[PDB]
Amino acid sequence: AAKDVKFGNDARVKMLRGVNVLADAVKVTLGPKGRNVVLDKSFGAPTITKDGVSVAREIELEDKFENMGAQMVKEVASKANDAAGDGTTTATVLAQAIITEGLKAVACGMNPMDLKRGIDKAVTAAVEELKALSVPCSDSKAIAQVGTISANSDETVGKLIAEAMDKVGKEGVITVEDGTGLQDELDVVMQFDRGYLSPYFINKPETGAVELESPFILLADKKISNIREMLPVLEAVAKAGKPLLIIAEDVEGEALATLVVNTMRGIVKVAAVKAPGFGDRRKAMLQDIATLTGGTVISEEIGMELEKATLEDLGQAKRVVINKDTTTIIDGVGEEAAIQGRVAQIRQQIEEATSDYDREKLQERVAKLAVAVIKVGAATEVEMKEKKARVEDALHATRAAVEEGVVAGGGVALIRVASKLADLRGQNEDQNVGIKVALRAMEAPLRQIVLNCGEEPSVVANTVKGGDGNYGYNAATEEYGNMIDMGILDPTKVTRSALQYAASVAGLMITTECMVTDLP
Amino acid sequence: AAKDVKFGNDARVKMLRGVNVLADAVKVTLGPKGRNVVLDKSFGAPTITKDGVSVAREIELEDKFENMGAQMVKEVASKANDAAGDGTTTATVLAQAIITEGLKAVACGMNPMDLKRGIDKAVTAAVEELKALSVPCSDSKAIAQVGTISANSDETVGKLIAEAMDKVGKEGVITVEDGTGLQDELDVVMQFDRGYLSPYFINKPETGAVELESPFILLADKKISNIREMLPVLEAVAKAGKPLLIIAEDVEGEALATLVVNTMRGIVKVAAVKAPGFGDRRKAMLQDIATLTGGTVISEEIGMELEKATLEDLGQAKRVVINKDTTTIIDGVGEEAAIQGRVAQIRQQIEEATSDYDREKLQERVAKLAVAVIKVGAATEVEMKEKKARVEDALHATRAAVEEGVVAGGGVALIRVASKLADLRGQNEDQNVGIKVALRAMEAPLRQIVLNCGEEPSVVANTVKGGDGNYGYNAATEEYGNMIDMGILDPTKVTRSALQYAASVAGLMITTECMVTDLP
Amino acid sequence: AAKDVKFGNDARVKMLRGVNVLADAVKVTLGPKGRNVVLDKSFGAPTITKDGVSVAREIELEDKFENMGAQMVKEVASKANDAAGDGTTTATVLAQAIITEGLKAVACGMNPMDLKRGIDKAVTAAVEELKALSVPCSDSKAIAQVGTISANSDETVGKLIAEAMDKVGKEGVITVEDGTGLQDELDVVMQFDRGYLSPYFINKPETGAVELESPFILLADKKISNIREMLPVLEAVAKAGKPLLIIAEDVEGEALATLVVNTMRGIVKVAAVKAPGFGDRRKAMLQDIATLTGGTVISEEIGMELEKATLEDLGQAKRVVINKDTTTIIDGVGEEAAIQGRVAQIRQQIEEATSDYDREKLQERVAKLAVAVIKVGAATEVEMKEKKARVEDALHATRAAVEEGVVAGGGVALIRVASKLADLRGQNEDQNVGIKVALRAMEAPLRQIVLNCGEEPSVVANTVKGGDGNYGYNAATEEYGNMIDMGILDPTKVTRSALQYAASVAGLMITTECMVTDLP
Ligand SMILES: Nc1ncnc2c1ncn2[C@@H]1O[C@H](COP(=O)(O)OP(=O)(O)O)[C@@H](O)[C@H]1O
Ligand SMILES: Nc1ncnc2c1ncn2[C@@H]1O[C@H](COP(=O)(O)OP(=O)(O)O)[C@@H](O)[C@H]1O
Ligand SMILES: Nc1ncnc2c1ncn2[C@@H]1O[C@H](COP(=O)(O)OP(=O)(O)O)[C@@H](O)[C@H]1O
Ligand code: BEF
Ligand code: BEF
Ligand code: BEF
Ligand SMILES: [K+]
Ligand SMILES: [K+]
Ligand SMILES: [K+]
Ligand SMILES: [Mg+2]
Ligand SMILES: [Mg+2]
Ligand SMILES: [Mg+2]
């Protein structure tokens, strides 16, 4: 289609105007005295949220150029989210603050491509400075604090995540789901979503569930319909005394019917449950179980009959628990060599996962082998969704603090790094201005946090810069102090990520001399 | 449809106005103090780029005639790209500079078709003059410099490409891909795009790949479905101790199933992978592998059964590595006589290749026998794509410098050729003006590079023309000197290509007396 | 009326756009390779002119703010004209060149009010530097040159003005009028536009005019109708032998009739002519004549009867010449003390003249007492008016060169002053930039002159700045040399005036932060 082509200052002013709309919608949520944004949503109720990327993703403007602005800087907020899990607002605030200052310089005749070089150099330095300030965070108290700050000063959420990480470990997974109840709730566990096929198996009507004591485990890839196939293996289990769990694609009536009357009487004690999953993921998951239990997958496709299985090919576990909905294998016989080998394999399967969905289900399986769920409570569903948005962010920040330490929040970390790089210079004057652009931008987070409290950002910034180390402004309490003592901890990973991504995009955006888009 | 028909000056003014929009969008990216262009893109985020053809391809104007202008001159930028790989902006700048000057002459009553003859003559001369100035470029230092200048003064990219060409050789291929990491990365290897057929073969779950130590290699032209055919050869490998790779058209279930349970247990260690390619190219490539490994292709078509193969007909290698996507044969037993004989054969197959596509896949195979990938690092994805655009350009220029030498950059090469052709005349006055049009256009690259630094192009041009040999303007450092000493090298091939293509199109465009297009 | 109010950058961009239209229309006429502007004019034929103020005065723009721009800077061109008489284009070119550079600085955050202080300081210095370079110009050759350059390289006009000033002196007046003839023409002369009332007075039918030898002169304020009033004075003249001129408001029939028959016969020799002027100007002019002739105005209003006059109250002259159209008094008896006293009185009457018309008729009378007329020749009337416009400008420049010396033209004078003030600084950085703004503007005249020749202004500017003293570019001949040797002389007064006035206005214009005007 015919294009509209704009040059130079015109193009840039438009590009900025756009950036500002997105920026300005996201910045209002920054900090403890941040407010929420309402995002209309065609199919049903609107969404209230504080989560900066969520606001960002919705912005799309009418004017084709302004839109381009907003659509590029949207990537800062968006990438922060994909790497860190928090800091998306901060990232957005920095980006704006660079772009704005940089473009002002470009308008003064300075060479954009050098302004970029400056910015980038200043940032590579700032990243290293932040790694210096970073003190690690591994005690449950510190984690609870990060969690708390991350969930907009909600101590319960901190406490609850800290408890969760304590219980699953660090090689263990935590999910968040909508609760049915009005208050928050933590559940901890290998298990999968499949119940008994035969309700006449429940050997403990107390719980309404089957409790097989120290049983064998048969892993059938194919779906079973005839009892003929079972007889060989069923025989060896009947003369072994131990019970048996059968996890095949399905246990059909003809072969199910029998199995029932056999446990009915006490000839063998057997359970039947469908296989966890669908398609290639099922065979993959079914294999995971074999490794945990020391059994062989009896895959009909790769040249095995179900009749030619023996006790050899059966897995074993310490105990098994199956109800109407879920099956649980407690402590399988499989050797931890084979297990961690199988895990470091699935760990690198998540590396080559180019899609988010391919990553979800993979780390689910590694947790089953190396798991907790937080249920979020709220009165209504508008409430549910802002809360659940904060819990996720919190969890992410906690995992990030663990893996890369913490720094003083309230945007002070960045303000310090800026004073430490006060002597940084480049190859020429334009690059210098470029550095100074970035350092001045490093103040923006603190400045905006203060501005969302309706207090004079210049005055607070000055006072924090007059101090040392972890002296900062506590925006919630409206007085100064030691940010680490007051529990105001940002993960290093997030603060770093915010800065790197803002710089990457904003840097390039300053180099714009022409814009090409479709006509209206 | 009904047409709008315009004549003479009206038609030309429109045609120019169009050229200028495209030209003017591309010219802003020229040179080290060049800036970037933003190209909106319907499905997701916009693109920032310096790459002149990329900008050009997007231009399409509303006014039906102006569009025609832009759509014709778009071919200069586009063809430069397809032949050279760099110089697309330069090409575009020349084209404009001719068209503009030529049309001005046409308006003065001079006979276009002669102005063309002049231009073309001046260019045929300039091409030869450039071949004189060309000094070859074969040491890694010179190549790194071309690479560097080509990637807008990014020394890492130069260094990295220079290292690459040093390692793959000159009969070896280099690709560029998006990196996962934040910094640039070079990987070097025979390999082909095929994974294991049987995921139950991975003998090292660390990498999630099969690592067959010093194995035999079976090359089956036909597709396998029955284990009967394998037994004779499988037998001799089972009593030899060494593992076996099977590279046939396909390993079907019945014959696959078995092979699995055999390595499953440790009876033989075998891998199964499809054959690289399709049709006649497959048999050709399958044969290449036989030569590298000292094996025989067991081609069912030319009177061989798979059962009548023995250890005799199997290839051998030092090591084999196969994952989900690719199979690699490290250091095959095949004798280097047979190999280089097979290569000098495929080398002359590329000579008779009259189509580009027939040339692509052929030199791919010669590289497999005589390969590297550069992964580009960046923070975000907007960044990734401008960088990856520069790396490709750089690589192209380096390969072009190697094959046709270098000349002084900063557009001086052309400025010299213009002073050397100061005595060139034609058959009549109009042809003379035509020559002078081209020579004056030869200054444009330097002039625009200087103009993107915001300095007086006339003043710099004068000063460079006052000098000799490789005296030029260094736009980055803003002072004059010896361009070769300062590492400012353009490949001859690109400078030549730019000039030839601009001239070809612009020449014709000057001959326009009528334009016919659809009504609005 | 309701106002539109614009602030800051918006207001300034508009203001500039306006300046540029006016500037851009005037700048095209600068220099020897300057072109002409056509100004439409409601009542009849349009006007072709080179005269920069004439173009300026017509510019008025539609957009209310742009207009304000143009309407303010119009004053530069206009004031230059009222003080100097030439340099109006130059003045306009400087003004633009300041405003443009200054506003660019204002946009960079520099404090306008300081930029002004800088500019003004740099100019006060430049004014003094110009007075240093000024060499006086008093020989007819130098004046002819100034005249020539001023009339766009028309040697005749130079020659002709030089001749004129040589003949009238420096205390003598030169006017320019439309000629009837096709070629230029100079006439030299106290006289006024009144013929004899009585055609029967002509005492020399050769010329058809009255030639009264060494006569008395009667100055009657009132209009005469009765011969009674005359008898007393007529008597004393009849017994004195000398003739008599009668310059009253009118000589009515009854008193005219008689006077005729008296000279008819030879009783007295008398002439009768109306008084020069109308109303208060008549009595004023009639008084001028009394002073030149040593007579008394017989004013009926201030208590004098015409009968009570004697030979006492009559003026006297060496000779008198009267024809059908004009009366001339050659060399009156009045003492030069009384004359120059009367002149230095009328000289200060022109000082308090706040209207142009009050100034016209006053300097006419001072010329009658302290005269030459140039008649301009041309074929048509479009031609007449561009030529007459150049002659006036030339005359002005010549009178200015005489009173304040000359400097090297081609705008070099200013370029030198700029290199001499290269060390000038202010009280702070913004003031420094302000100085540099002015010095850079000083190059504009030369740069535009060169640009109207279609040659590279940067290249010429550089080459002139590389030289010394009066080395400059001769735009007419297209080669460099000594501007004074080549006769390319600008009057100091004009070059100074241009600079001062541009600076005054442009200085203020840079301080604009808000604009208030009526709605559309
Ligand atoms: N009580 C507080 N005083 C000052 N700063 C705080 C306080 N609580 C949180 N913050 C800071 O405000 C920032 C707000 O983060 P948030 O608004 O969730 O946006 P983001 O997407 O950038 O995490 C945190 O980095 C934290 O440093
Ligand atoms: N530092 C420098 N000084 C002067 N010229 C340079 C410098 N670096 C690169 N160039 C020149 O500028 C040209 C810019 O090429 P580029 O802008 O990528 O457009 P193209 O598509 O024509 O390669 C190169 O040919 C090179 O000669
Ligand atoms: N032959 C020449 N070469 C260079 N400069 C010239 C020549 N003739 C005139 N000039 C310069 O050009 C200027 C032109 O004056 P003009 O165009 O009449 O505008 P203005 O209203 O400023 O006098 C003069 O100041 C003179 O210095
Ligand atoms: F805006 Be962040 F994700 F808290
Ligand atoms: F514009 Be080129 F491809 F560097
Ligand atoms: F424009 Be000037 F009065 F010659
Ligand atoms: K937020
Ligand atoms: K380019
Ligand atoms: K003029
Ligand atoms: Mg947060
Ligand atoms: Mg290039
Ligand atoms: Mg003049």
User: Which residue out of A442, A449, A496 has the highest number of ligand 1 atoms within 8 Å of its CB and is therefore the one to mutate?
Assistant: A449
CA distance B214 to chain A (A): 24
What is the C-alpha separation between A411 and A26, in angstroms, rounded? 17
Size of interface B-C (CB pairs under 8 A): 12
CA distance B41 to chain A (A): 8
Residue A10, phi-psi category: left (phi > 0), alpha (psi -120 to 50), beta (remainder): alpha
DSSP secondary structure code for residue A196 in this structure:
B
| Ligand 3, atom 20, residue with closest C-alpha | C87
SS3 call for C415 = helix
Beta strands in B265-370 (DSSP E): 270-273, 297-298, 315-323, 327-332
User: Which residue out of B28, B35, B149 has the highest number of ligand 2 atoms within 8 Å of its CB and is therefore the one to mutate?
Assistant: B149
Strand partners, A212: A320
Neighbours of B266 (CB within 10 A): 7
In chain A, breaks (C-N over 2.5 A) are found after 189, 370
What is the C-alpha separation between A234 and C447, in angstroms, rounded? 105
Question: Quick check: CB of B453 below 6 Å from ligand 2?
Answer: no
What is the C-alpha separation between B294 and B217, in angstroms, rounded? 9
User: Which residues in A37-62 are b (16+ Cβ under 10 Å) and which e?
Assistant: beeeeeeeeebebbbbbbbbbbbebe
Tokens representing C517 are: 């005007």
* Whether B356 contacts B371, CB under 8 Å: no
- In sequence order, the 6+-apart residues with CB closer than 8 A to the CB of B337 are none
Give the best residue of A16, A108, A429, A433 to mutate against chain C (max C CB count within 10 A): A108
What is the C-alpha separation between C468 and C453, in angstroms, rounded? 23
Which residues from chain A sit within 8 angstroms of residue C107, using beta carbons? 107-108
Residue A186 has phi, psi (to 5 degrees) of -115, 125
Q: Do A344 and B206 touch (CB under 8 A)?
A: yes
Which residues from chain A sit within 8 angstroms of residue C436, using beta carbons? none
3-state SS of chain B: helix, strand, coil percent to 5? 50, 15, 30
**Polymer length in residues for chain A:** 520
CA of C80 to the centre of ligand 1 (A): 64
DSSP secondary structure code for residue B197 in this structure:
S
Residue C489 has phi, psi (to 5 degrees) of -110, 120
Alpha helices by DSSP H, listed for B175-219, are none
- Give which of A496, A498, A462 is closest to A98, Cα–Cα: A498
- In sequence order, the 6+-apart residues with CB closer than 8 A to the CB of B314 are B216, B217, B218, B233, B237, B244, B295
User: Which residues in C42-76 are b (16+ Cβ under 10 Å) and which e?
Assistant: eeeeebebbbbbbbbbbbebeebbbbbbbebbbbb
Which residues from chain C sit within 8 angstroms of residue B462, using beta carbons? 456, 459
Alpha helices by DSSP H, listed for B333-478, are 336-349, 356-369, 381-404, 412-420, 429-442, 444-451, 457-466
What is the C-alpha separation between B417 and B125, in angstroms, rounded? 9
Q: Is C338 annotated as ligand-binding?
A: no
* Whether B74 contacts B22, CB under 8 Å: yes
What is the C-alpha separation between C449 and C27, in angstroms, rounded? 9
Place of tokens 């001239």: B503
CA of A51 to the centre of ligand 7 (A): 4
Place of tokens 């189509």: B355
Q: Is A310 annotated as ligand-binding?
A: no
What is the C-alpha separation between A327 and A412, in angstroms, rounded? 50
User: Around A207, how many Cα atoms within 13 Å sit in the side-chain half-sphere?
Assistant: 13
What is the C-alpha separation between C387 and C397, in angstroms, rounded? 15
Question: Quick check: CB of A53 below 6 Å from ligand 1?
Answer: no
Name the strand (E) or helix (H) holding A513. Answer: strand A512-518
Query: Which chain C residue's Cα is nearest to A104?
Result: C108
User: Which residue out of B86, B92, B495 has the highest number of ligand 5 atoms within 8 Å of its CB and is therefore the one to mutate?
Assistant: B86
What is the C-alpha separation between A244 and A338, in angstroms, rounded? 23
Distance of CA B451 to the CA centre of its chain: 29
Evaluate the CA torsion angle C449, C452, C457, C459 in order and state its sign.
Answer: negative
- Give which of C225, C12, C204, C240 is closest to C107, Cα–Cα: C12
* Whether A316 contacts A333, CB under 8 Å: yes
Where are chain A's structural domains? 1-134+406-520, 135-189+370-405, 190-369
SS3 call for A207 = coil
Q: Which chains touch B (3 or more CB pairs under 8 A)?
A: A, C
Q: How was this one solved?
A: X-ray
What is the C-alpha separation between A497 and A414, in angstroms, rounded? 12
DSSP C307-367: TT--GGG-EEEEEEEEESS-EEEEEESS-HHHHHHHHHHHHHHTTS--SHHHHHHHHHHHH
What is the C-alpha separation between A109 and C107, in angstroms, rounded? 11
Which residues from chain C sit within 8 angstroms of residue B459, using beta carbons? 456, 458-459, 462
Closest-lying ligand 3 atom to the alpha carbon of residue C90: 22
In chain B, breaks (C-N over 2.5 A) are found after 189, 370
CA distance A513 to chain B (A): 6
DSSP A17-61: HHHHHHHHHHHTT-STT---EEE--SSS--EEE--HHHHHHH---
SS3 call for C63 = coil
Question: Quick check: CB of B474 below 6 Å from ligand 2?
Answer: yes
Provide the pairing of β-strand B297-298 with B216-220.
parallel
- In sequence order, the 6+-apart residues with CB closer than 8 A to the CB of A219 are A247, A248, A286, A289, A290, A295, A296, A297, A298, A315
Start-to-end Cα distance in chain A: 10
CATH topology of domain C1-134+406-520: GROEL; domain 1 (1.10.560)
Tokens representing A435 are: 């550095």
How many helices (H) and strands (E) are present in chain A, helices listed first? 18, 19
Strand partners, A251: A224
* Whether C450 contacts C460, CB under 8 Å: yes
Question: Quick check: CB of B52 below 6 Å from ligand 5?
Answer: yes
* Whether A176 contacts A376, CB under 8 Å: yes
What is the C-alpha separation between C264 and C255, in angstroms, rounded? 14
- In sequence order, the 6+-apart residues with CB closer than 8 A to the CB of A359 are A350, A353
Per-chain residues with Cβ under 5 A from ion ligand 12: C 86, 150
Question: Quick check: CB of A89 below 6 Å from ligand 1?
Answer: yes
Query: Which chain C residue's Cα is nearest to A107?
Result: C108
- In sequence order, the 6+-apart residues with CB closer than 8 A to the CB of A220 are A246, A247, A248, A249, A298, A306
What is the C-alpha separation between A346 and B136, in angstroms, rounded? 51
Closest-lying ligand 3 atom to the alpha carbon of residue C92: 22
- The strands making up A185-188's β-sheet, listed across from edge to edge, are A174-178, A372-376, A185-188
DSSP A80-139: HHHHTSS-HHHHHHHHHHHHHHHHHHHHTT--HHHHHHHHHHHHHHHHHHHHHH-B---S
- In sequence order, the 6+-apart residues with CB closer than 8 A to the CB of A82 are none
Tokens representing C65 are: 């703010």
* Whether A442 contacts A126, CB under 8 Å: yes
- Give which of A296, A297, A200, A193 is closest to A253, Cα–Cα: A200
Which residues from chain A sit within 8 angstroms of residue B454, using beta carbons? 109
What is the C-alpha separation between C96 and C17, in angstroms, rounded? 11
Strand partners, B472: B481
Q: Is A24 annotated as ligand-binding?
A: no
Give the best residue of C108, C110, C440 to mutate against chain A (max A CB count within 10 A): C108
- Give which of B329, B334, B495 is closest to B412, Cα–Cα: B495
User: Which residue out of C36, C393, C489, C493 has the highest number of ligand 6 atoms within 8 Å of its CB and is therefore the one to mutate?
Assistant: C393
Query: Which chain B residue's Cα is nearest to C460?
Result: B459
Strand partners, B6: B515
Residue C280 has phi, psi (to 5 degrees) of -65, -25
Which CATH class name applies to B135-189+370-405? alpha beta
Which residues from chain A sit within 8 angstroms of residue B378, using beta carbons? 504
What is the C-alpha separation between C182 and C245, in angstroms, rounded? 37
CA of A79 to the centre of ligand 11 (A): 30
CA of A151 to the centre of ligand 7 (A): 9
Start-to-end Cα distance in chain B: 10
Q: Do B33 and A304 touch (CB under 8 A)?
A: no
| Ligand 1, atom 15, residue with closest C-alpha | A31
What is the C-alpha separation between B364 and B373, in angstroms, rounded? 13
Does the fold of domain B135-189+370-405 match that of domain B1-134+406-520? no
User: Around A166, how many Cα atoms within 13 Å sit in the side-chain half-sphere?
Assistant: 14
Closest-lying ligand 2 atom to the alpha carbon of residue B446: 5
CA of B81 to the centre of ligand 5 (A): 8
Provide the pairing of β-strand A315-323 with A37-39.
unpaired
Closest-lying ligand 3 atom to the alpha carbon of residue C93: 22
Q: Is B430 annotated as ligand-binding?
A: no
Residue type, B280: D
Q: Give the Å distances, CA to CA, from C272 to C195, C250, C320, C327, C331.
A: 9, 8, 12, 10, 19
Documented resolution in Å: 3.6
What is the C-alpha separation between B350 and B320, in angstroms, rounded? 29
Residue B187, phi-psi category: left (phi > 0), alpha (psi -120 to 50), beta (remainder): beta
Question: Quick check: CB of B86 below 6 Å from ligand 5?
Answer: yes
Start-to-end Cα distance in chain C: 10
Question: Quick check: CB of A248 below 6 Å from ligand 1?
Answer: no
* Interface residues of chain B, partner chain C, Cβ below 8 Å: 456, 458-459, 462
* Whether C295 contacts C252, CB under 8 Å: no
Ligand 4 pocket: which residues have CB below 6 Å?
A 51-52, 86-89, 393
* Whether B437 contacts B483, CB under 8 Å: no
Closest-lying ligand 5 atom to the alpha carbon of residue B152: 4
* Whether C415 contacts C442, CB under 8 Å: yes
